[PDB]
Copies of this chain bind each other. A is one copy, B any other.
Amino acid sequence: NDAQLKFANDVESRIQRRIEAILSPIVGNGNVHAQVTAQLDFANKEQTEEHYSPNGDASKATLRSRQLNISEQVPRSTQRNETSNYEVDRTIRHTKMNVGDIERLSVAVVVNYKLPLTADQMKQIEDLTREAMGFSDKRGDTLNVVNSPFS
């Protein structure tokens, strides 16, 4: 039950090593630190969709029987019985979702001075980090990069 903590530390070490080894070429070998807080999903979570295609349209129905009596007298006392049996296009996914996905990432990046870095270089550094995390606004990952003199 501490294996989960070891595992999340492994994931954060991977992404942290990645950001450091991708941004070390630009800023310097030791002028950058990153600590990534990965919240991981450890819920066992199956799922079983079962979709059917709507066969409401008679031009894409698929009958198997059709017993269609049409009486008609003429006091136009008509009639129209109409049985049917259809066949249905049925998809059945049976997912057994993963134990250990990343629900969300949080990355904090500090980059040393040189003199404050230029704004364009800051934008492109943010973009590199955004690609190195695997940033996904779907998961709501949040990245914060700052430049401030070290000590």
Binding site for B on A (CB under 8 A): 1-5, 7, 9-11, 14-15, 18, 21-22, 25-29, 33-35, 37-39, 41-100, 104, 106-108, 110, 112, 121, 124, 127-128, 130-136, 142-144, 146, 148, 150-151
Q: How far is the CB of A108 from chain B (nearest CB, A)?
A: 4
Bound complex: CA A50 to CA B146 (Å): 45
Q: How far is the CB of A12 from chain B (nearest CB, A)?
A: 8
Q: How many copies does the complex hold?
A: 5
Bound complex: CA A94 to CA B46 (Å): 5
Q: How far is the CB of A140 from chain B (nearest CB, A)?
A: 9
Bound complex: CA A140 to CA B151 (Å): 33
Nearest residue, chain B, Cβ from A8:
B14
Within 8 Å by CB of A95, from B43, B66, B98, B128, lies: B43
Nearest residue, chain B, Cβ from A95:
B45
The CB with the most chain B CB atoms within 10 A, among A11, A27, A58, A148, is that of A148
